[PDB]
């Protein structure tokens, strides 16, 4: 059984590597020092990064940034979908259930992985070629300035766990196979798979972090912070439905 647990952990790791270009190890290497990324700390550096970078979706700053985040989210959704398909048992599930699990899981996964790109002072952007400051994002006009902040608070807590990519792969898989998403038709094989994934995660944390007491529990506890962050994000998405500022574009985004 342990054999299958480690084989699973490895499979998931390889698949995570193939699906997500910018890994946590890479991101960390960039954030600490190892070809320094362009830094966006204010208006002028933003404009410079627009001209010198590849972020023009051919007019107010906060709205442009928000839309960028949108575009990148749609890409992430495709990457996560591809990863989900590699989870043993996943494609064998009822197709409606696959859709439901992805639809409810992508936000939680996006914030999880976003933590890998973040420190307390900012977030790697543009494939890791840039770094936008926390203070700059906070300085954005309301309510756009309040979007990223809760996520920095989450990431600071989450990053304290010092998980690596091989831990994260399994964790993300556990997140996808959540039996309590609304509207599931057949919960049983979902919870069966998830229980296998949770055993794999347990073994992984125990081997990879022998000195981290109850890391498994703390990680599981982080799911509360994730769901909360997702709820809050939704809550201020509703507020943006004020702000009177591409119908095909309006179609591409959920």
- Residues of the shown chain interacting with ligand 3K2 in the complex, contacts defined by CB under 6 A: 55, 65-66, 68-70, 72-73, 76, 107, 110, 114, 123, 125-126, 132, 233, 237, 249, 253
165 binds, among a copy of itself, ligand 3K2, none (CB under 5 to 8 A by kind): none
Q: Is position 181 annotated in a ligand binding site?
A: no
Binding mask 177-216 for a copy of itself (x = CB under 8 A): ---x--------------x--xx--x----------xx-x
Q: Is the CB of 188 or the CB of 254 nearer to ligand 3K2?
A: 254
11 carries a ligand binding annotation: no
Helices (H), the chain: 2-19, 24-32, 43-52, 61-85, 95-116, 134-138, 149-159, 165-176, 187-208, 215-240, 247-252
Q: Which stretch binds a copy of itself (CB under 8 A): 20-28, 109-117, 161-169, 224-232?
A: 224-232
159 binds a copy of itself (CB under 8 A): no
Contact partner at residue 221 from a copy of itself, ligand 3K2, none, CB < 5 to 8 Å by partner kind: a copy of itself
User: Does residue 115 contact residue 121 with C-beta atoms inside 8 Å?
Assistant: no
Angle of helix 165-176 versus helix 2-19 axis, rounded to 10:
100
Should residue 217 be labelled a site residue for a copy of itself when binding is judged by CB under 8 A? yes
Residue 170 tokens read as 């399994």
The values of phi and psi at residue 207, to 5°, are: -75, -45
In the stretch 107-136, what mask flags binding to a copy of itself with x, by CB under 8 A? Answer: ------------------------------
Long-range own/partner contacts, residues 12-19 (CB < 8 A, 24 or more apart)? 12/86, 12/87, 12/169, 12/170, 12/173, 12/200, 13/165, 13/166, 13/169, 15/83, 15/86, 15/87, 15/169, 16/83, 16/165, 16/168, 16/169, 16/172, 17/165, 19/79, 19/80, 19/82, 19/83, 19/86
Task: Kindly state the tokens that stand for 74.
Answer: 């749609």
What is the rounded radius of gyration, in angstroms, for the C-alpha atoms of the chain? 19
Give the residue with the Cβ less far from ligand 3K2, 106 or 193: 106
55 contact, one of a copy of itself, ligand 3K2, none, CB 5-8 Å limit per kind:
ligand 3K2
Q: Judged by CB, which is closer to a copy of itself: 220, or 236? A: 220
Question: 107 labelled as ligand-binding?
Answer: yes
Q: Give yes or no for a contact between 192 and 114, defined as CB atoms under 8 angstroms apart.
A: no
CB of 108 to a copy of itself, least distance (A): 11
Q: Which residues bind a copy of itself (CB under 8 A)?
A: 157, 180, 195, 198-199, 202, 213-214, 216-217, 220-221, 223-225, 227-228
């Amino acid at each position: 059984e342990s054999a299958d647990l480690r084989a699973l952990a490895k499979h998931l790791y390889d698949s995570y590597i193939k699906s997500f270009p910018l890994t946590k190890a890479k991101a960390r290497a960039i954030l600490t020092g190892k070809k320094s990324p362009f830094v966006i700390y204010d208006m002028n550096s933003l404009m410079m990064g627009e001209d010198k970078i590849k972020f023009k979706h051919i007019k107010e700053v906060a709205i442009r940034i928000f839309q960028g985040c949108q575009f990148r989210s749609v890409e992430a959704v495709q990457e996560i979908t591809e990863y989900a398909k590699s989870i043993p048992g996943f494609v064998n599930l009822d197709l409606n259930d696959q859709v439901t699990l992805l639809k409810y899981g992508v936000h939680e996964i996006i914030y999880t992985m976003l933590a890998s790109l973040m420190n307390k002072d900012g977030v790697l952007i543009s494939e890791g070629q840039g770094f936008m400051t926390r203070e700059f994002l906070k300085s954005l006009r309301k309510p756009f300035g309040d979007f990223m902040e809760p996520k920095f608070e989450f990431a600071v807590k989450f990053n304290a766990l010092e998980l690596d990519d091989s831990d994260l792969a399994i964790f993300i898989a556990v997140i996808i196979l959540s039996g309590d998403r609304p509207g599931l038709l057949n919960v049983k094989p979902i919870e069966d798979i998830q229980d296998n994934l949770l055993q794999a995660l347990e073994l992984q944390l125990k081997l990879n972090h022998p000195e981290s007491s109850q890391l498994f529990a703390k990680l599981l506890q982080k799911m509360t912070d994730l769901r909360q962050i997702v709820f809050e994000h939704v809550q201020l998405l509703q507020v943006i439905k004020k702000t009177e500022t591409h119908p095909l574009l309006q179609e591409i985004y959920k």
